[PDB]
């Protein structure tokens, strides 16, 4: 009964910023972590960062500087913000629930295309 739904901007121009929302249902944002994962067209999964139930966050060292993750416990929403988009920022972006060393529930993802 967990449900995660992502919504994003679709097509965006290089250098602009991107904001993605992960709306969750059936569980509490205070009791679980939420991870952000992306997938470039035809490539593998790439871990972006996580926000813990307590509000502490962790990021991919390589992207750390371009990314921001936050949440609104009240609204049951987690957000991903990326500044200075590159064309290779094109991918399907997913949010997934984290429980004891495992991503048990995933949203269906949202496609972002960085195109001028």
């Amino acid at each position: 009964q967990v449900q995660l739904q992502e919504s994003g901007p679709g097509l965006v121009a290089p250098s602009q910023s991107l904001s993605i929302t992960c709306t969750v249902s059936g569980f509490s944002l205070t009791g679980y972590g939420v991870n952000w994962v992306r997938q470039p067209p035809g490539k593998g999964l790439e871990w972006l960062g996580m926000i813990w139930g307590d509000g502490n966050t962790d990021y991919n060292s390589a992207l750390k500087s371009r990314l921001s993750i936050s949440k609104d416990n009240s609204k049951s929403q987690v957000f991903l913000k990326m500044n200075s988009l590159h064309t290779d920022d094109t991918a399907r972006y997913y949010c997934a629930r984290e429980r004891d060393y495992r991503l048990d529930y995933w949203g269906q993802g949202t496609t972002v295309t960085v195109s001028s």
Partner: peptide
């Protein structure tokens, strides 16, 4: 952990902590 991903779907958890099946 191990995940299975089908065409056009999000990944799905198969195994965790090396040997435990979901």
């Amino acid at each position: 952990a191990w995940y299975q991903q089908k065409q056009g779907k999000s990944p799905q958890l198969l195994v965790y902590y090396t040997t435990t099946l979901a």
